[PDB]
Design an enzyme around this catalytic site. Structure first.
Site, short mmCIF file in Angstrom:
data_model
loop_
_atom_site.label_atom_id
_atom_site.label_comp_id
_atom_site.label_asym_id
_atom_site.label_seq_id
_atom_site.Cartn_x
_atom_site.Cartn_y
_atom_site.Cartn_z
N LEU A 36 0.49 7.87 2.33
CA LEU A 36 0.99 9.18 1.89
C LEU A 36 2.14 9.07 0.89
O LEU A 36 2.24 9.90 -0.03
CB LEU A 36 1.41 10.03 3.10
CG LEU A 36 0.27 10.46 4.03
CD1 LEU A 36 0.82 11.02 5.33
CD2 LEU A 36 -0.65 11.47 3.36
N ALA A 38 6.01 6.32 -0.04
CA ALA A 38 7.23 5.65 0.42
C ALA A 38 8.41 6.63 0.43
O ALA A 38 8.82 7.12 -0.62
CB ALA A 38 7.55 4.46 -0.48
N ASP A 152 20.51 16.30 5.95
CA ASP A 152 19.76 15.70 4.84
C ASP A 152 18.65 16.62 4.31
O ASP A 152 17.48 16.24 4.21
CB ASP A 152 19.20 14.33 5.25
CG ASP A 152 18.76 13.47 4.06
OD1 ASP A 152 19.20 13.71 2.92
OD2 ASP A 152 17.96 12.54 4.28
N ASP A 179 22.58 3.60 11.97
CA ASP A 179 23.38 2.37 11.99
C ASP A 179 22.54 1.15 11.59
O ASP A 179 22.95 0.37 10.72
CB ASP A 179 23.98 2.12 13.39
CG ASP A 179 25.03 3.17 13.78
OD1 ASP A 179 25.32 4.08 12.99
OD2 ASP A 179 25.55 3.07 14.91
#
Ligand SMILES: COc1ccc(-c2cc3c(cc2F)ncc2ncn(C4CCNCC4)c23)c(Cl)c1
Ligand SMILES: [Ca+2]
Ligand SMILES: [Ca+2]
Ligand SMILES: [Mg+2]
Length: 310
Positions: A36, A38, A152, A179
């Site tokens: 689909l 990256a 985001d 992290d």
């Protein structure tokens, strides 16, 4: 805004009924259909869950980590089971297998809005009205029902489909995953987040505002286009770009070609002071949104014609 119609209630109940049949997700129970694209630190595949026959979207995050760390990431991702909303992408499950975390989600056949934009050139105002409604409601759901902000918002994190649905994905849930991965672009972050100061859900509103401007004009809007480029329409390094966001005035839509209601909406989203900037409650009753909600726009039909879903 939180209240749903019967079509949305039926579809969400249908998703859960199908999900209950799936059970525990395992690595060997998946067959690759296609790539689909990256995305954020990993490749997303369209896959078939062979036992259940369900098509899914599977993101693989390649990481070399011990059993302690990875098992903590899988339990942190379990909150996505509770995130049940028409404006949030469905979650099937998450697991680790051979040096890579897998996140299995609802497949959205229209792809993301960065892909749709690249296909469309630019997206019409009325279409972006429906996009705006969905992002606000998606952000309202995460904040009200889970005490969560997205962190985001960007065109690649807004997914769409041929049933006309517009949904958010990749909201902050696992602290340990961020992290271990530490990656993604900071070019949609609010000025106060780039200054490391008091940031909240207001920071997502900036990101929406900026994304809508990009999709409207057909180009990431910082720095602003020239007077000649705007006529033709209608390199900064990342560090130079992030400094521009903090220090210079915010982007705006060009005048004449968009309604003053849409211009005002994005302006209120892109006020650099987060206190002065509009909130989700204020945006939900904004003139652009009220008008957009009343407009019966065929988003599904527009999408299929634009991206060539035969
Ligand atoms: C938690 O992290 C994520 C984020 C998004 C998806 C996700 C991507 C999809 C998708 C469904 C999805 F759930 N459906 C169709 C489609 N087409 C292109 N893409 C991607 C291409 C790379 N850019 C981002 C979109 C996707 C997944 Cl599984 C996990
Ligand atoms: Ca295997
Ligand atoms: Ca095996
Ligand atoms: Mg991300």
């Amino acid at each position: 805004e939180l209240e749903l119609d019967e079509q949305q209630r039926k579809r969400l109940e249908a998703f859960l009924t199908q999900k209950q049949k799936v059970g525990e997700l395992k690595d060997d129970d998946f067959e690759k259909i296609s790539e689909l694209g990256a995305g954020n630190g990993g490749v997303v595949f369209k896959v078939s869950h062979k036992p259940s026959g369900l098509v899914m979207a599977r993101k693989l995050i390649h990481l070399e980590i011990k059993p302690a760390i990875r098992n903590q990431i899988i339990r942190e991702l379990q909150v996505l089971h509770e995130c049940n909303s028409p404006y949030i992408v469905g979650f099937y499950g998450a697991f680790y297998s051979d040096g890579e975390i897998s996140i299995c989600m609802e497949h959205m056949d229209g792809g993301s809005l960065d892909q749709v934009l690249k296909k469309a050139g630019r997206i019409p105002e009325q279409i972006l009205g429906k996009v705006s409604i969905a992002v606000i409601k998606g952000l309202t759901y995460l904040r009200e029902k889970h005490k969560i902000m997205h962190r985001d918002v960007k065109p690649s994190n807004i997914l769409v489909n041929s049933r006309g649905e517009i949904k958010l994905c990749d909201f902050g849930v696992s602290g340990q995953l961020i992290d271990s991965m530490a990656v993604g672009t900071r070019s949609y972050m609010s000025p106060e987040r780039l200054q490391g100061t008091h940031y909240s859900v207001q920071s997502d509103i900036w990101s929406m505002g900026l994304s809508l401007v990009e999709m409207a004009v057909g180009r990431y809007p910082i720095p602003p286009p020239d007077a000649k480029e705007l006529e033709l329409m209608f390199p900064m390094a990342i560090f130079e770009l992030l400094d521009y966001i903090v220090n210079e005035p915010p982007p705006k839509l060009p005048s004449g070609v968009f309604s003053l209601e849409f211009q005002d909406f994005v302006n209120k989203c892109l006020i650099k002071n987060p206190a002065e900037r509009a909130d989700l409650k204020q945006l939900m009753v904004h003139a652009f949104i009220k008008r957009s909600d009343a407009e019966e726009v065929d988003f599904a039909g527009w999408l299929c014609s634009t991206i060539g879903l035969n």
